[PDB]
């Protein structure tokens, strides 16, 4: 006995050939063949339109990855099973299918807590987010650090691996540039108070140090880029002298109490100051 046999230890079901040619015709673009097979399956009963290929792909998930908007409507005018088919069209950034699915209102790749408004914010589209906020949606609110309610202590001892993921998901959702520039009242002062308390969290949670550390960096380039898009001097004078609730630099002092080293080391901010440190010496272009 110098040979090694081979076999399958974990078996599953197999499909039939009649079903096979259906899914084979869906993958090639034939429109006159599938439209017949959809019709003979209503007088006779030999095929079920909810089959699944070896890799778990159904007849509606093959027409989404190949962008075909003429077979989707044909499969949708007939009654098919639409499950989590809206989360597969937001990960692959297409626009027509999204609307189209909105208008006709046990295995997956997504955790049971993901919602569409939260998944559309992990990606950074601007046109898809604007379509979901015109309808009413909502995002939960995370508790403060060292909170000691009965909820924070009871759930943290019945399942401790699921409770530590939702906070990370929420904090990844809240920190996207598009949402901050679309739904905030002051887009500059909200990146100062949020890029400072994502770093304290990097000391109590030793497991996700790198993640929290990197999330704290997307909130320091946004303000710099938003600032260096100016085209005149009156715009600079108006911005740097804004006080909420006289004429001194009342907004360049708040950027020093937060340790923002890229917002105060810019050519324009370093040229506005040089004209006040050399007052009384009109020209420094000397030997």
């Amino acid at each position: 006995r110098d040979r090694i046999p081979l076999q399958i230890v974990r078996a599953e079901t197999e499909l039939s050939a009649e079903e096979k040619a259906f899914l084979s015709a869906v993958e090639k673009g034939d429109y006159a063949t599938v439209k017949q097979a959809l019709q003979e399956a209503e007088i006779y009963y030999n095929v079920n339109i909810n089959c699944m290929d070896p890799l778990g792909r159904s007849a509606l998930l093959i027409a989404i990855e190949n962008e075909n908007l003429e077979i989707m409507e044909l499969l949708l005018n007939h009654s098919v099973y639409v499950g989590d088919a809206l989360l597969y069209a937001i990960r692959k950034e297409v626009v027509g299918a999204v609307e189209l699915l909105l208008s006709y209102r046990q295995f997956s790749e997504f955790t049971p807590d993901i919602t569409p408004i939260m998944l559309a914010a992990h990606t950074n589209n601007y046109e898809i987010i604007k379509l979901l906020v015109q309808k009413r949606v909502t995002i939960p609110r995370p508790h403060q650090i060292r909170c000691n309610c009965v909820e924070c202590v009871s759930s943290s001892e019945v399942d401790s691996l699921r409770h530590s993921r939702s906070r990370l998901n929420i904090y990844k959702a809240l920190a996207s540039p598009s949402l901050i520039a679309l739904s905030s009242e002051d887009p500059i002062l909200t990146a100062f108070r949020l890029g400072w308390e994502l770093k304290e969290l990097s000391k109590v949670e030793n497991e996700f140090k790198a993640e929290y550390e990197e999330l704290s960096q997307q909130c320091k380039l946004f303000a710099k880029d938003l600032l260096d898009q100016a085209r005149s001097s009156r715009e600079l004078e108006i911005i740097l002298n804004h006080r909420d609730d006289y004429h001194d630099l009342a907004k360049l002092k708040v950027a020093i109490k937060y340790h923002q080293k890229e917002f105060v080391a810019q050519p324009n901010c370093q040229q506005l100051l040089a004209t006040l440190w050399y007052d009384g010496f009109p020209g420094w272009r000397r030997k």
Binding site: K28, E65, N68, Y126, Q229, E235
Partner: protein
């Protein structure tokens, strides 16, 4: 920068409308800045991205469907 009048060591021993107009002026600059930033960031993606395998399949499927429909019309 502040007016302290600090002498050297030896000689050291001897209402609504304004708020409204400011808040009204502060918003247009923000609007314009956001517009320009969004436009620039959308444009920047068009130029510095490579290709992958996904596009080849869509091209093949387009050609296939074109061929099938043309053959259906012409043959019959």
């Amino acid at each position: 920068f502040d007016e302290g009048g600090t002498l050297p060591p030896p000689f050291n021993i001897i209402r609504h409308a304004d708020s409204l107009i400011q808040n009204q002026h502060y918003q247009e600059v923000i609007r314009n800045l956001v517009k320009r930033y969004v436009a620039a960031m959308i444009r920047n993606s068009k130029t510095n991205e490579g290709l992958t395998e996904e596009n080849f399949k869509e091209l093949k499927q387009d050609i296939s469907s074109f061929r099938y429909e043309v053959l259906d019309l012409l043959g019959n």
